[PDB]
Amino acid sequence: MISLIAALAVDRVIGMENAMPWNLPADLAWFKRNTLDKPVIMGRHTWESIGRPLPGRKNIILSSQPGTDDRVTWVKSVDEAIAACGDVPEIMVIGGGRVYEQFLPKAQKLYLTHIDAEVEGDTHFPDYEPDDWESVFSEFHDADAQNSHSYCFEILERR
Ligand SMILES: Nc1nc(N)c2c(Sc3ccc(Cl)cc3)cccc2n1
Ligand SMILES: [Ca+2]
Ligand SMILES: [Ca+2]
Ligand SMILES: [Ca+2]
């Protein structure tokens, strides 16, 4: 199945100038745990910001243009990105904004980190219909010495 995984601050803001503003190591550990040993699909902008492939995951990059790095799998359409994953139990869509938008209708699961942070952003997570999704997991955490914001990991499944 297709899943999207994203970290959302106030107003569904996901990014600004191709970087996540906030410092949330607990979200980095949640992201790693839910993505490890699964193919990851990302947009070209997200690919450039990471610099190196995510290890122990097949890295699929969405770009209209020819690929510029042989360490990753390059595709030119949503359907090509899915087909390049082959037969796997779950496909992780990691962003960014435009990629989330396109994969949302095809997705069965959403792994959302809701961050209680006011951030200026130029990129937002899609405006998903809440009636279409069922929250099956929801774990709130207060801010601590390592995480400067309170945050909630949520798992939603398409009804
Ligand atoms: N919970 C969560 N979700 C992601 N998708 C993460 C990523 S990669 C990424 C960032 C923004 C967007 Cl839109 C997509 C992927 C990196 C580091 C931590 C991340 N944490
Ligand atoms: Ca490995
Ligand atoms: Ca739909
Ligand atoms: Ca805060």
Side-chain angles (χ1 to χ4, degrees):
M1 110 216 81
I2 296 155
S3 307
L4 314 202
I5 185 162
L8 275 68
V10 164
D11 296 318
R12 313 188 322 272
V13 168
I14 56 179
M16 187 66 163
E17 280 81 75
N18 247 284
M20 282 178 291
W22 60 80
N23 197 112
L24 284 199
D27 176 61
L28 301 175
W30 161 264
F31 173 76
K32 180 172 150 199
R33 178 170 51 253
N34 289 291
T35 62
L36 209 52
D37 310 308
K38 304 183 190 173
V40 295
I41 302 162
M42 81 193 78
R44 181 184 55 85
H45 293 303
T46 295
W47 162 244
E48 288 165 21
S49 61
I50 65 155
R52 180 180 183 81
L54 294 165
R57 286 157 278 189
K58 182 184 197 161
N59 290 224
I60 291 142
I61 326 304
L62 224 354
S63 182
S64 62
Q65 283 293 95
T68 59
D69 197 319
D70 287 4
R71 300 178 295 169
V72 297
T73 297
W74 291 90
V75 295
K76 291 178 193 171
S77 68
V78 161
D79 295 310
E80 194 194 351
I82 303 161
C85 293
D87 173 55
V88 294
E90 187 179 20
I91 296 155
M92 302 309 286
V93 176
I94 80 162
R98 199 208 152 183
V99 170
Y100 290 146
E101 273 175 24
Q102 294 172 278
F103 276 94
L104 182 71
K106 306 196 116 70
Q108 281 59 248
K109 207 165 169 180
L110 301 180
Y111 296 78
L112 298 191
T113 306
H114 299 281
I115 311 166
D116 302 306
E118 312 299 331
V119 287
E120 281 274 279
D122 51 25
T123 316
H124 295 75
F125 187 82
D127 185 25
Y128 69 96
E129 178 48 62
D131 297 1
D132 290 3
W133 300 86
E134 185 195 345
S135 174
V136 305
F137 178 99
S138 190
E139 284 296 316
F140 177 76
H141 295 86
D142 277 304
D144 59 29
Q146 296 179 239
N147 302 272
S148 71
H149 298 284
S150 47
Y151 54 92
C152 186
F153 304 123
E154 190 184 34
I155 303 179
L156 302 116
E157 295 184 327
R158 187 180 287 281
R159 290 181 182 280

